[PDB]
Subunit: 246 residues, 6 copies
C-alpha cells in the first residue's frame, strides 16, 4: 500500500495538489485510491502529448467512449466556448463514469475566464439547509437533451454519488434542460439559483484556471463539476478529456 | 437506492442513531451502505434472541468464524472482564473483518463501566499533530499474542483501513502486546499514551454504555474500537458478537 | 418538570423538531418551556381540525384576539390574509397587544413546493454576532411604523432575551400593510440599512425556511424570534393556515 | 429599556465585565436582566462598606437569609476564612448552586471582597456556563444528568433535582464531592451507581465543566464584586489553606 | 513596556476601540506599537481642535506632506466634501492604501471628525484586514495578487507592487476601480488580463474583502478619531453624494 | 521583494515547511522576513557541514556569541549542552544579549525517535486566546530568574509582536541551569501557575514538536516564539546539534 505526497487544495482538507515528479513516480492505484477521498487531483507542469495522456488515463479502468478534444469550437456546446453548468459525467448518455481526466494542451490569452470548477458535494449536502437537501433527496429530477429521470443520489456506501444537471445561465447555448416534477418553472429556477449559490461557496468550491501542462483528475462519484464561459475569440483553450470506469 | 432515517451521534456528523422500527424496516444494503460513511450504527430497544441476531448480521456478508458470547468470564481475556484496548477486528488472526455487530443480551448492575467505545480514525488522522501521524505512516508496527507485522494503514481508497493493537493498561490481563521497530520501550509507551489521549478526545470518540436490547454495528475499516474494564463481580454483561466480510 | 425528546433544527442547536406522538403526549408547559430557549417548534404529520388546534394553543395562556383563530387562506385583495410577502416582524406591535406564542397549522396545501414559506430568524444569536454598525442602529436609533407614525421599540429587555419588535419594509411589488421609517435617516439610508440587515438575518446560521405540508404545526416564541412569510402569488396555489396567538 | 455598557468575559460571549461607574449609575433592573443571559457580572474597584453592599444587593429581590425561623437579620454572610468551618472555612467548596427549592431558592448571589492579602493564585471563586456545557457535552455525560437520581447528605439521603426547567434555562442544582483532604459539609451519590462509578462520573464531568470555554476563575482583589445568576451558572470555591492568607468576602442572596 | 486598555473591534481580535481618556494618557509609542498588530484604532468623544490634532499625529513620525517641492506646510488635509473634487470630494474612494514607496511612503493615517451632520448611513470610512484576508482567500484570487503585474494611471501607466514584504506584514498597495457613476482620479489594469477579466477579478476580490470577518465600517460622528496602520490595512471611503450632508474630516499622515 | 514557496506547519497557518532546494535558492532576507510572521522554518534533507551552516546563519545579522557556533552534543554533567530538559524559554535573557534568530542544525542523530525533541510555541496566538487569569499574571506581575535574582520582563512591545522573555521551571529530576520566581507569589502558587500555563502553551493549536533527523534545519524567530528541549537521557542516543544565533 503505497503513499503519494500531496497537499490539500481546500481549507477543509479536500483536494490534492501533487507535484509532477511525484505524480509520475506513483503507481496508478495510489492516485486512484487518493481520488476517492480527495475528490480531485491537480498536477501542474506536466509535459505530455496526447498518446502519453491516453497511457496515463487508460490504466485507471475501462475507457468510456477515446480522447475528446475540447478546443472551443464556435457553433458547438460541449466542445464549444460557453458555460457547461454543474454536472457529473455520464448520466445523460447512461454510461458509468468513475474518473474524468482533463489535460491542458494549449492555453493562450485567458487568465480569469474558462475555469473548470469542482464541487465537494458530500460536504455540501451534509452542511446545507434542510430545505435544499429535502428537494434533492425526495423529489424527482428529469432532464431532456438539446424527458427522462436522473437519480440525484446513488448510494455507493462510501459516498452518495451525485448525478444532477443544472440549467444553463441565460445567454449560454444549452446542451440540456432540467425539470423537477411537481415544481413550477418559477420554483425550479429559484431552487437551482439558491442551491447553485450554496455549492459555489469557497468551502466546497474550487476554480481551476488553466495553464499549459495542467492535469485535472476528478472522481466523478465524489464531485460534480462545471466549465465557466470563455466567449472571447482571442482565447485558445484546448483540453484533452479521458474517462474511465470499472 | 433506499434511505434510512437517522440522527448523527457525533457533533461532526459521524455515527448513526437509528430507531429500532426504522432499522428493522430497512434493507440490509441500506444499513451496510450507511456504515461505510458513518462508521457506526446504534440501535436501542430491539428485542431479539440469538437466532434472530444471527439472521440480521449474516445478511451483511460471509460470516467470519459463529456467534461469540462475550459474557464476562473470570479467567479469560477477550471473553473476560477487563479492558480490551484500541483495536480493529481481524488482523491478529489474519481474517478480513468488514462489519462487527454487538448485541446486549443482558446488562445488570453497570452504569458507568464496561463501555464499548468507538474512534473516528479517519478524522483523527486528518487532524492529529504531524509527529503522531508520521510514526503511524512510516514506522513498522509489530504485535505478539499472549512477533509479526500488522500494517497500520491499508488503502481502500474511500478510507485508509486501520489495523493497530494498543498496549493494555497496567493491571489489565493482556491478550496482546505491541512493539514499534527502532523504538525503545520508553518511546513506544510514550507514543501510545499520547496517541491514545488524542484519539479519546470527544470530537472523535464515542462511549457506549450498554443496556438490554442495544445493537452496536461497526464498520471495521472506518473505525477502531475498545472495551473499558468491568472488573466488579456484581456486573452482568452479556454481549453477542457477529462478524462479516465480503 | 418533564422532558420532550427533540432534535435541533439549526446547526447552532436552535429550533426543535418534535415527533407528533411526542408532541401530543407532552404537557403544554414542557413545550412552552422548550420554546423560550429554542425559539421555534416544528411538528410534522399531525391530523387535527380547528377545534383541536384551538384546544392545543389556548392552554399556553390568554388568547390574543384579532375572534380567536385567524384563517390565513390567501384571499385576493388582502394583505396579512393575502397572497404576498409579509416581511420580517414579530406579532402584536401594530395593535398594542402582547403576543408571547404564535401557532401556525397547515390545514391544506396544494401545488406549492418552493414558495409561500414561513421563515424564522434567531435574532438573539444574530444580534450577538452582527457587525457593530448594524447593531448600533437597532440599539440607539428611533424606529417608527405607519399602518397602511408611531414609535416601536426595537428591544425590550426581558432578561432572558431582548425581545425584538421590528417591521421590515415590503419588497417593491408586494402590497404593503405597513411602512417603516428611522428618525434622522433619509429614504436612501433606511432602505440601505434594511436591505443589508435583511441579508444578515437571512444567513443560514440564523434562518430557517419552513415549506408547508398538510398537517405541519409551527409554533414560535414571539419574544425569541422574528418571522416572515414569503410570497405565493400563483393562483394555482392552495395555502390555508390556521393561526393562534397567546400571551401571559 | 435601559442598556449598560459591558465587555464579555468568555470568548463565547458569556459573562459581563462592567466598569464600576457604569455599574453604580445603572438601574438594578438593568443588571438583573443582564445577569439572566450573561450568567455573571464582574466589577472591579468598588470601594463600598457592608451597609452599602447590603443596599446594592437587597434591591434585586427578597433577601434570602443564610442557614427557630427567620426575621430578616441573617442577610450578609461573612466568609472570612474561619478555621474549623466549611462554608465560612478555608477549604474547597466544590461545584454547586446556592439555596434549594421553593421558598429557599436563590436567584442571585453576590460576593464582595472586603479584604484580600497574600493571595495571588489560590482561593478563586470559579464560575461555570452550565447551559452551554450541557448543550456541548458527550451524550453519555448528559444522559446521567438528565435521567438518574442524584442524592446528597449533609456531613439522611435526599433527592436533589439536577434540572429544573424555567424555560429560559434549565436551573441546575448539583453538589459535587469535595476533593480528598478537603473538609466536607456534603456528600453526593447517584442511585444505582456504585462508588467507583459515581467517583468516575464526577471526575469526568468536572473536567468537562472546567474547560476554558465554559469556566471562569476569579482571583480576588479588594473592591471586586462578583454577581451570579444562580439559575444560570454553578460555582465553586478553590482552597486557600495557607495561614498567611487574609480572604474576607461578604455574601448576599436574593430571590423573586 | 507600557500597555493601553482596549477592546477588539473585530470578532477575530483585530482592531482596537480605545476610550478617549486612556488614549490621551497613553504614550505615542504605545499606540504606534498597538496599531502594527491591530491595524486600526477607534477613539470616540475626543474634543480637540486642528492644532491639537496636529500635535497628536506629528509625534508618530515624520509628517508626510499631501499632494515645486515641500517645506512642511502641507500637513493637515481637510477633506470637507468639496464639490468638483475627488479625494476631497463627495464620491467613493475605493480600496487603496495611502502614499507610495520610498520617501513618499505612509506608515500611519489619521482621520479626525471635525463636523458631521445629516448623515447616518453613508460616507463611511471602511477598513480591511488584508493579511488575514490573503491568508484565507481562495488560492485563485491570491495567485493573481502575488504573480501578476498591476498597473494604475491617474485620470501614463505605472506599476504598483501589490505586496512589499516587511516581514511582519506584506504591506499592500492596490488601487481598486471606482464604481460606475463615481468620479475617478484613478484607473487600474492588470497586465495580460482583458477588461472583462480585470473587472471580474476586482468585483470578486472586493466581495471577499468586504466580508465582516475582515471588514469594518466606520460611520462618522463629531469627535471620532480613526488611526490606521497603512502597512497593515487597506481602506475605502463610501460615497456621500447628498447635498444636505456636512462631512468634514482632518487628515494626517506619518512615516518612519 | 521575493517569495519562497512554503507550506504551513500549524493548522492555524503558523510555521513554514520549506523544501531544501527552495531554501538554498532563496535570499536570506526572504527567509528572515518569512520568520517574523511565521515564527519558525523547518527544512529537511539538507547536507551541509558547520562552515556552510555558519555562512547561512551569519548573513541574517550580527553573530551573538556564547565563540560563534555552539555544539549541543549531549555532554554528560552539563546543562544546556547536556542531556536533559530545557523548559520553555527564549534565548538571550540570562546574559543581556539580544537574540533575534536562533538556528538549529542536525549533524548526527542516532537511536532516537520519540525523545529529545525541540519544541516550538506560538506565544502570540496563545496569549490572545488564553484564559484572562493566566494572561493577567504574565502582563502585570514581576517575574525574576536566578542563574544556577534579577527581573526579566515578560513582554517587550515591539509593535508587530510582544516579544516574550520567560524562563519556565525545570521538571523534578531534570538538572536546572536556572530557577524562576514570581514576586508576591508563594512557592505553591508559582509552581501551580507554571504547570497550568505550560499545559495551555502545549496545546496542539500553539505547539509543534520537532523530532530530529540528519540534515534537519530548524530556524526560530526568537521574538515571535518560545521554545523548549525535551529530555534525551538514554545513553544509546546520539544527538549532535549545531547552534547559531543572530541579532540586529
Ligand atoms: C462526458 C459526459 O458525461 N458529459 C459531457 C458533458 C455533460 C456530460 C453528459 O452526459 O452530457
Ligand atoms: C475478533 C477480533 O478480531 N478480535 C477479538 C478482539 C481483538 C481481535 C483479534 O484479532 O484478536
Ligand atoms: C448558600 C447556599 O445555599 N449554600 C452555601 C454553600 C453551599 C450551599 C448549600 O450548602 O446549600
Ligand atoms: C494620501 C494618499 O496617498 N492618497 C490620497 C487618496 C488615495 C491616495 C493616493 O491617491 O495616492
Ligand atoms: O472543458 C471543460 O473545462 C470541462 C468540459 C467537461 O466538463 C466535459 O467534457 O465533461
Ligand atoms: O465486549 C466488548 O464490549 C467488545 C469486545 C470486542 O471488541 C471483540 O470481541 O472484538
Ligand atoms: O406565514 C404566515 O402566513 C403567517 C405569517 C404571519 O406572521 C401572520 O399572519 O401574522
Ligand atoms: O467563598 C467563596 O468563594 C464563595 C462561597 C460560596 O459559594 C457559598 O457560600 O455558597
Ligand atoms: O474621507 C475619507 O473617509 C478618507 C479619505 C482617504 O482615504 C484619503 O484621502 O486617502
Ligand atoms: O534543542 C536544543 O538542544 C536547543 C535548545 C536551546 O534552546 C539552546 O541551546 O539554547
Ligand atoms: Fe463534464
Ligand atoms: Fe473487537
Ligand atoms: Fe406574524
Ligand atoms: Fe455557593
Ligand atoms: Fe486613503
Ligand atoms: Fe534556547
Amino acid at each position: 500500500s503505497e503513499i503519494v505526497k500531496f497537499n490539500p487544495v481546500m481549507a477543509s482538507g479536500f483536494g490534492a495538489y501533487i507535484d509532477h515528479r511525484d505524480f509520475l513516480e506513483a503507481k496508478t492505484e495510489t492516485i486512484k485510491n487518493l481520488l476517492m477521498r480527495q475528490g480531485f487531483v491537480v498536477v501542474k507542469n506536466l509535459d505530455i502529448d496526447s498518446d502519453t495522456f491516453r497511457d496515463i488515463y487508460s490504466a485507471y479502468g475501462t475507457i468510456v467512449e477515446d480522447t475528446l478534444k475540447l478546443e472551443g469550437e464556435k457553433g458547438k456546446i460541449v466542445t464549444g466556448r460557453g458555460q457547461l453548468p454543474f454536472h457529473a459525467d455520464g448520466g445523460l448518455l447512461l454510461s458509468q463514469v468513475d474518473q474524468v481526466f482533463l489535460y491542458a494542451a494549449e492555453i493562450k490569452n485567458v487568465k480569469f475566464r474558462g475555469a473548470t470548477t469542482v464541487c465537494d458535494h458530500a460536504l455540501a449536502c451534509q452542511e446545507m439547509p434542510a430545505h435544499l437537501l429535502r428537494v434533492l433527496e425526495e423529489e424527482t429530477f428529469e432532464v431532456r437533451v438539446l424527458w427522462f429521470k436522473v437519480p440525484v443520489f446513488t448510494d455507493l456506501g462510501w459516498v452518495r454519488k451525485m448525478l444532477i444537471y443544472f440549467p444553463f445561465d441565460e445567454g449560454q447555448p444549452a446542451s440540456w434542460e432540467p425539470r423537477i416534477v411537481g415544481f413550477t418553472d418559477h420554483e425550479t429556477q429559484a431552487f437551482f439559483q439558491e442551491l447553485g449559490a450554496f455549492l459555489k461557496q469557497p468551502r466546497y468550491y474550487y476554480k481551476h484556471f488553466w495553464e499549459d501542462g495542467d492535469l485535472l483528475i476528478m472522481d466523478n462519484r465524489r464531485v460534480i463539476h462545471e466549465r465557466e464561459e470563455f466567449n472571447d475569440d482571442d482565447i485558445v483553450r484546448r483540453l484533452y478529456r479521458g474517462q474511465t470506469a470499472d
